[PDB]
Amino acid sequence: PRRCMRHHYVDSISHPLYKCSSKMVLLARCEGHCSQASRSEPLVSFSTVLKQPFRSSCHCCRPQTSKLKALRLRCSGGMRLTATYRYILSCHCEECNS
Amino acid sequence: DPRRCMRHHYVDSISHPLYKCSSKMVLLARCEGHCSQASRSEPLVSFSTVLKQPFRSSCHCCRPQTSKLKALRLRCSGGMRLTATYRYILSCHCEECNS
Ligand SMILES: [Cl-]
C-alpha cells in the first residue's frame, strides 16, 4: 500500500547556534508513493534551442493544508527565543513543479 | 521489468503550430515509469519571521539522463523552410524533483 499518507512523530526543537533547553513537540510529515507514473517527453521548438527541452509530469507527496505554530525556547542567558514551523494536517499527491 | 523508470519509443508527426507545412514523421523517445523511492515532505523550523518555504522535500521523478540534440527542416506553404529542434532521449533515470 504505502501511498501518500500523513504521519505523526515527535522531535525536540533546538537552536542550531545558541544553547537552549530542548523543547519536544508533536509534528507531522507527508510520506508515501503517489500512484501516477512520472514521465518526460521532448518539446519541439521552431524558435530556439530550448532552455528546457522537456515536458514532464511528476507527483510528489506533499502537505495539502497545514497550521502555523509558534514555539518559545528557554535559551541560556535568560533568553526567551521563538521558533515557527507548520503542523501538517493533510497530505496529497501534487505536481513536482506547479 | 516492473513498471519502473525506463525509455519508451514512439513515432511522432512534427508540424508547426501556426504555419501550414508538410509534416515529417520522426522517431522519438520519452521517459515514463514509477520510481521506487517514496516521496516525502517535512516541516522546517526557523527563528526568523516565518519561512517562505516551510518544508524540506524529497521526490524522485523519471527524467532524461542523457539525450542528443536533433534538427529537422520542414517544408512550408509559403515556400519557406522552417527548422525545428528537439532532444532525442538516450537514457532515463530517477532524479530529485528540485534539480
Ligand atoms: Cl536547411
Side-chain angles (χ1 to χ4, degrees):
Chain A
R2 53 197 319 175
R3 54 138 197 170
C4 183
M5 249 180 305
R6 182 157 144 284
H7 289 105
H8 285 88
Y9 70 106
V10 302
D11 196 343
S12 60
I13 315 310
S14 305
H15 204 291
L17 302 191
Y18 300 93
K19 321 143 113 237
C20 329
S21 214
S22 257
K23 232 150 178 130
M24 73 172 38
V25 61
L26 188 72
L27 299 172
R29 62 163 146 263
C30 303
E31 219 204 328
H33 294 80
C34 294
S35 57
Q36 304 90 333
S38 57
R39 50 183 190 280
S40 186
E41 67 194 30
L43 292 165
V44 176
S45 173
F46 288 87
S47 5
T48 176
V49 76
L50 273 184
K51 41 282 213 241
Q52 158 75 275
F54 303 109
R55 184 201 279 121
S56 57
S57 174
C58 186
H59 278 89
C60 308
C61 191
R62 288 188 185 159
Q64 179 164 224
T65 214
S66 73
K67 161 170 67 189
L68 176 64
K69 303 290 264 155
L71 194 57
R72 293 61 149 212
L73 272 182
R74 329 234 168 276
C75 225
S76 82
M79 255 170 119
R80 18 120 60 229
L81 229 47
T82 213
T84 55
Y85 66 92
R86 293 197 92 95
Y87 188 79
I88 302 173
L89 297 164
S90 62
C91 307
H92 69 154
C93 288
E94 178 189 303
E95 275 293 346
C96 154
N97 272 332
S98 317
Chain B
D1 324 5
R3 354 137 274 161
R4 82 161 190 280
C5 175
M6 63 177 176
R7 221 160 46 117
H8 302 68
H9 291 76
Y10 62 107
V11 354
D12 193 28
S13 290
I14 310 290
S15 57
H16 200 281
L18 273 24
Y19 299 109
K20 290 175 292 177
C21 306
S22 287
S23 56
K24 264 170 200 213
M25 273 173 297
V26 114
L27 179 70
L28 293 174
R30 59 184 151 82
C31 301
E32 186 162 41
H34 299 76
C35 296
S36 59
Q37 297 105 331
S39 54
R40 71 202 285 122
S41 199
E42 289 162 14
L44 293 168
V45 183
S46 93
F47 308 78
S48 165
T49 253
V50 64
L51 265 205
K52 225 241 282 246
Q53 166 55 300
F55 311 100
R56 104 188 283 270
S57 300
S58 172
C59 185
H60 279 84
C61 309
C62 190
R63 287 186 183 157
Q65 160 152 248
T66 56
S67 61
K68 177 182 167 156
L69 183 64
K70 307 287 285 154
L72 184 71
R73 335 303 176 289
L74 241 39
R75 276 118 215 178
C76 301
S77 53
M80 11 166 71
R81 32 81 156 143
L82 269 34
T83 299
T85 56
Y86 59 93
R87 289 204 152 255
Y88 190 85
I89 300 173
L90 293 165
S91 69
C92 301
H93 74 331
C94 293
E95 147 184 335
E96 276 290 352
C97 154
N98 84 268
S99 68

